[PDB]
Enzyme design. Structure first.
Site, PDB file in Angstrom:
ATOM      1  N   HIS A 183      -3.566  21.020  22.083  1.00  0.00           N
ATOM      2  CA  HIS A 183      -3.338  20.840  20.655  1.00  0.00           C
ATOM      3  C   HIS A 183      -4.508  21.407  19.855  1.00  0.00           C
ATOM      4  CE1 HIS A 183      -1.517  19.224  17.089  1.00  0.00           C
ATOM      5  NE2 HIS A 183      -2.618  18.557  16.790  1.00  0.00           N
TER       6      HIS A 183
ATOM      7  N   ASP B 141      -5.780  22.167  16.183  1.00  0.00           N
ATOM      8  CA  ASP B 141      -5.650  21.979  14.746  1.00  0.00           C
ATOM      9  C   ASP B 141      -6.296  23.112  13.967  1.00  0.00           C
ATOM     10  OD1 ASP B 141      -4.338  19.408  14.462  1.00  0.00           O
ATOM     11  OD2 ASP B 141      -6.108  18.594  15.477  1.00  0.00           O
TER      12      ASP B 141
ATOM     13  N   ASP C  88       2.249  16.231  16.522  1.00  0.00           N
ATOM     14  CA  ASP C  88       1.265  15.562  15.677  1.00  0.00           C
ATOM     15  C   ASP C  88       1.568  15.215  14.211  1.00  0.00           C
ATOM     16  OD1 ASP C  88      -2.375  15.916  15.363  1.00  0.00           O
ATOM     17  OD2 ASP C  88      -1.144  14.215  15.968  1.00  0.00           O
TER      18      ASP C  88
ATOM     19  N   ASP D 250      -6.149  17.277  22.669  1.00  0.00           N
ATOM     20  CA  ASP D 250      -6.813  18.089  21.655  1.00  0.00           C
ATOM     21  C   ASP D 250      -7.771  19.121  22.235  1.00  0.00           C
ATOM     22  OD1 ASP D 250      -5.418  16.471  19.984  1.00  0.00           O
ATOM     23  OD2 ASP D 250      -7.145  15.767  18.823  1.00  0.00           O
TER      24      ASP D 250
ATOM     25  N   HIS E 274      -0.782  19.963   9.267  1.00  0.00           N
ATOM     26  CA  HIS E 274      -0.756  18.517   9.089  1.00  0.00           C
ATOM     27  C   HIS E 274      -2.110  17.857   8.820  1.00  0.00           C
ATOM     28  CE1 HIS E 274      -0.877  19.341  13.443  1.00  0.00           C
ATOM     29  NE2 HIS E 274      -1.703  18.313  13.485  1.00  0.00           N
TER      30      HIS E 274
HETATM   31 ZN   LIG Z   1      -3.169  17.796  14.921  1.00  0.00          ZN
END
Ligand SMILES: [Zn+2]
Ligand SMILES: *[C@@H]1O[C@H](CO)[C@@H](O)[C@H](O)[C@H]1NC(C)=O
Length: 1014
Positions: free
Chosen positions: A60, A62, A174, A311, A441
């Site tokens: 994941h 971000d 997420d 993550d 997000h």
């Molecule tokens: Zn995230």
């Protein structure tokens, strides 16, 4: 066309109905804290029926959160992708899925040709698989559907061009809660499957017990089911390894081989992972398979999905080795031990779904149908994630502004083919990507660290400038005689004038049109109307003189109104908030009439005295101990008086009554009708002094809101023929009610200042007998019925208000439309409330590591529509959807896609034309050309232009509504050679249209068309 109003869909699971029945009890279910002790029959699987397990490695990433996009890229992501390329290349059976294309594109373009080829090979062979393929994994609460589509298109267009692949399976692990807008867009973009994760723990338990975690998700109004998209909901608390192998995290954590020590990670359940060996593999496998079979009990097929990631995982080479080698040993043992009756292997998301449907076709499983949404999310106890519906409201509002600028820039420049030197494609790509990135997000959600929020803001500011450049260059070309047109692609022919962004009191950004006998007698201005129908709207400009008159290009006088330029200041000396008027700048207001998707030119001319067609507003300042307010050349003198109730009416519109505090008290639709009670009130929510505290994600109020002490605020009343308003300086908010003849516009200049642990809410109190029902929209696409549940805490009854909300009874409805996504609810019959801003000192334990103390002044905008609905044909009491009226829909459009205003920079515009688009069809009011984008560069022999057409559904309340032309987007540009219906991303041709005519769409439908021109 399906009737989206009178036929209540028959579905197995309807979320509003489920919510009504659920008890939401938060009991300790054992190792699976929010579930129960799963039991299974070992004899369920055998040699003739094995459990197929797909372990899907993932990471994941971000695109910004506690670090900026670039920081994460340099520190983590580039290494994850570089090592993924190496490890997958060297281990043919290893698999990996990737979701965030913003990062992948950043990486790929930096790769040498040799590596690019190796990368394309592992994608082509199926080892590396893209899931969803959007620029980001967008927020689903605050995002507008138009931007969700924009970012999906940005990512997939890149994938098609460079990877030659288009994902048909979506992965959203997420977002904080999920919206049906996703399957809506995905299903219309070629998708066949989707996966979600963050849903209320009570919902996971309820659906798990009925094995309804996999379902055909259709829209709430879809009776036939053509919008259905197969959806897989993960059953546990997190997407990390401890919560993805089975119900017991203490066991699953032992199978996350990166938690042995050297990586600085461990298992909080106290039992560390152990390297698999021939000596312990039998026991290790027995434990793992047991977890797998327990998870399998929650689903209907013999195909199990086991995500393996967290993550920013799979960063170090040693990590790839530790996970792969240990799992390989488990697979070899498990698959060779018949007594397990399991066949496990590394796989991709698509492989899982393919197997599931193969089992379905084999007739071993039938899936339930479902409609509804998955808000508001709670990951544990009473921790509902409704705070992010409002966090960082400045950027939430900025999102909507940029959304419109991108649409306008792409549309205005689409009319022509541009030379590469104009850098049009370059600027548009930049704009689309920065806006797309913000859909993340942790972007629009307002859940990122302060410096990351700043990065997003800077990126969007650059995007806005790129948009302005493209727009102004386009206007100049569209309105200048062809044989005179001589463009300097770096020159600013026009300056954009935006009256609501950043907004008055936020940033003095808009320019003043300076006119004078000794310098410049007149100035040309141009308005753009991105909507596909003729539109009139009042527009205003700042001018250096009150003696200005307006004319159209035919030199026809246009009625105008001049008002002062008022600015509010927090007088540190007098300790009061009062307005000061400019003595050198004035506002001129007039009605602009613009063609569908067109332009209209007007001229502002100065005179020595008051012009015949320009009127001047009166101004009344209400407060005790007033002081003079000079306005320079302004004709009428300001009047003063003690606070008192006032009533105003513009044109034949409604009559509004205000309290002596300058707040709305009632609305009278007609001279005959009565004064309907509609009261505006500002209150504040606090934070708990015990237990969990509110933060960027969580809303944990310390009880119902308390009224804001207003004292004796200063009220300013401006009365004009075209526009009137009542503004009041309240603590933290300069509240303004503007009237232009129809539903009023509300503007709040919100500056929460240093009020720590405070959330400011704006509430409307009425006599509408709404009970426990209210409606809120989802991504500006549809309105869903909400039911206030007293069995749930206050924060659970808060929902996203991305663009609007309303309450109604048998005869009356009150709709509040917004120009920015914010959180809101209806906590009592007849009420509507929406959060303005929140300032929180503490962190809410979700990893952010900070509260929200970086508030800044923001100008929120709204439209307030009170209507009689006793004659409207509405859905039955059991229908899960709601629909706007024509007036409310148009009010929403006035906020999200207002007319654009351009001021000619130079002194004289040679070859100027007065209008563009006068021949464009004026489409029915419920139809919109959401997107117009030229898809080809100038060198392409056959030019292609794409259009996204959306038709909403407006209630029929007895209004004739006539004279409208059929809109055929394929004939908007000349020399059409072919017309094709395509997926919403324009990536796949679905139909060759005869006659090259693009037919309009059905209510609530969205279609895409591409016209080719020779
Ligand atoms: Zn995230
Ligand atoms: C892209 O993939 C398709 C799969 O149908 C294949 O036929 C085509 O040759 C590929 N084009 C390239 C080389 O990108």
């Amino acid at each position: 066309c399906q009737d989206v109003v009178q036929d209540v869909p028959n579905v197995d699971v309807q979320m509003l109905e489920l919510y009504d029945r659920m008890s939401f009890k938060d009991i300790d279910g054992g190792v699976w804290k929010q579930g129960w002790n799963i039991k299974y029959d070992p004899l369920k699987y055998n040699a003739h029926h094995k459990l197929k397990v797909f372990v899907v490695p993932h990471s994941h990433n971000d695109p910004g959160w506690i670090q900026t996009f670039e920081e994460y890229y340099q520190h983590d992501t580039k290494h994850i992708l570089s090592n993924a390329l190496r490890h997958l290349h060297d281990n043919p059976e290893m698999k990996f899925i990737w979701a965030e294309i913003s990062y992948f594109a950043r990486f790929y373009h930096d790769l040498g040709e040799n590596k690019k080829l190796q990368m394309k090979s592992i994608v082509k062979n199926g080892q590396l698989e893209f899931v969803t393929g959007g620029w980001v994994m967008p927020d689903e609460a605050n995002s507008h559907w138009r931007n969700v589509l924009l970012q999906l298109t940005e990512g997939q267009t890149w994938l098609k061009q460079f990877m030659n692949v288009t994902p048909t399976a979506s992965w959203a692990i997420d977002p904080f809660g999920h919206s049906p807008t996703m399957p809506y867009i995905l299903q219309k973009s070629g998708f066949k499957n989707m996966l979600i994760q963050r849903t209320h723990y009570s919902v996971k338990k309820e659906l798990a017990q009925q094995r309804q975690l996999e379902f055909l998700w259709r829209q709430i109004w879809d009776n036939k089911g053509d919008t259905a998209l197969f959806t897989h909901m993960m059953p546990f608390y997190s997407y990390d390894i401890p919560h993805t192998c089975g119900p017991d995290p203490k066991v699953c954590c032992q199978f996350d081989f990166k938690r042995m020590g050297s990586f600085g990670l461990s298992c909080p359940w106290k039992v560390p992972p152990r390297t698999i060996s021939d000596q312990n593999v039998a026991a290790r496998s027995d434990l793992l398979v047991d977890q797998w079979k327990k998870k399998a009990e929650l689903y209907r097929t013999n195909v199990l999905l086991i995500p393996l990631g967290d993550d920013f995982r799979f960063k170090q080479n040693t990590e790839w080795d530790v996970q792969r080698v240990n799992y390989e040993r488990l697979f070899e043992h498990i698959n060779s031990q018949a007594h397990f009756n399991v066949q496990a292997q590394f796989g991709t998301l698509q492989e899982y779904f393919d197997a599931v449907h193969q089992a379905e076709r084999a007739g071993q499983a039938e899936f339930p149908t479902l409609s509804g949404d998955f808000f508001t999310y709670a990951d544990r106890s009473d921790n509902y994630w409704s705070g992010y519906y409002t966090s960082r409201p400045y950027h939430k509002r900025m999102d909507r502004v940029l959304m419109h600028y991108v649409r306008a820039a792409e549309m205005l420049s689409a009319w022509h083919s541009w030379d590469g030197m104009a850098r049009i494609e370059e600027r548009l790509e930049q704009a689309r990507r920065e806006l797309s990135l913000f859909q993340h997000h942790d972007g629009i959600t307002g859940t990122a660290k302060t410096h990351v929020v700043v990065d997003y803001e800077q990126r969007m500011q650059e995007a806005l400038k790129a948009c302005q450049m493209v727009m102004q260059q386009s206007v100049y070309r569209l309105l200048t005689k062809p044989s005179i047109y001589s463009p300097d692609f770096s020159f600013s022919y026009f300056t954009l004038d935006d009256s609501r962004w950043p907004g008055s009191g936020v940033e003095d950004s808009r320019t003043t049109i300076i006119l004078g006998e000794d310098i410049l007698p007149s100035k040309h201005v141009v308005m753009h109307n991105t909507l596909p129908h003729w539109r009139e709207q009042l527009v205003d400009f700042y001018v250096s003189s009150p003696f200005v008159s307006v004319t159209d290009l035919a030199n026809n006088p246009v009625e105008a109104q001049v008002s002062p330029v008022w600015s509010w200041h927090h007088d540190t000396l007098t300790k009061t908030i009062h307005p000061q008027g400019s003595t050198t700048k004035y506002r001129i207001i007039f009605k602009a009439r613009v063609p569908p998707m067109g332009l209209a030119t007007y001229v502002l001319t100065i005179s020595d005295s008051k012009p015949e067609h320009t009127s001047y507003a009166s101004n009344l300042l209400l407060r005790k101990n007033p002081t003079s307010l000079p306005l320079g050349q302004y004709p009428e003198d300001v009047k003063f008086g003690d606070p008192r109730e006032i009533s105003l009416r513009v044109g034949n519109g409604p009559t509004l009554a205000f309290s002596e505090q300058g707040l709305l008290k009632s609305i009278q639709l007609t001279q005959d009708s009565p004064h309907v009670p509609v009261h505006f009130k500002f209150l504040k929510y606090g934070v708990r002094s015990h237990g969990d505290r509110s933060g960027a994600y969580l809303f944990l109020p310390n009880g119902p809101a308390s009224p804001v002490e207003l004292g004796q605020p200063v009220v300013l009343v401006t009365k004009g023929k075209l526009e009137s308003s009542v503004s009041v300086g309240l603590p933290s908010v300069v509240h303004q009610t503007i009237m232009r003849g129809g539903a009023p516009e509300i503007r709040n200049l919100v500056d929460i200042g240093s009020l720590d642990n405070t959330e400011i809410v704006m509430r409307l109190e009425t006599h509408i007998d709404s009970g426990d029902i209210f409606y809120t929209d989802l991504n500006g696409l549809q309105f869903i019925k909400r039911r206030r549940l007293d069995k749930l805490p206050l924060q659970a009854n808060y929902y996203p208000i991305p663009s609007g909300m309303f309450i109604e009874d048998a005869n009356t409805r009150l709709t509040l439309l917004t120009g920015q996504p914010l959180g809101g609810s209806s906590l009592a019959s007849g009420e509507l409330e929406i959060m303005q801003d929140r300032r929180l000192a503490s962190d809410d334990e979700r990893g952010l590591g900070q509260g929200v103390l970086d508030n800044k002044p923001v100008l929120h905008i709204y439209r307030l529509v009170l209507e009689k609905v006793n004659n409207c044909v509405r859905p039955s009491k059991l229908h899960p959807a709601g629909y706007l009226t024509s007036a409310a829909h148009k009010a929403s459009q006035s906020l999200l896609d207002p007319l654009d205003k351009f001021i000619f920079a130079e002194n004289e515009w040679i070859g100027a034309q007065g209008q563009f688009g006068g021949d464009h069809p004026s489409a029915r009011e419920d139809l919109d050309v959401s997107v117009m984008r030229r898809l080809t560069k100038s060198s392409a022999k056959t030019q292609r232009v794409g259009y996204v057409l959306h038709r909403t559904n407006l209630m029929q309340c007895g209004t004739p509504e006539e004279h409208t032309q059929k809109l055929d987007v394929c004939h908007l540009l000349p020399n059409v050679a072919r017309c094709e219906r395509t997926t919403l991303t324009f990536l796949q041709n679905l139909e060759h249209l005869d006659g090259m005519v693009a037919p309009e769409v059905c209510p609530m439908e969205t279609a895409a068309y591409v016209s080719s021109h020779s």
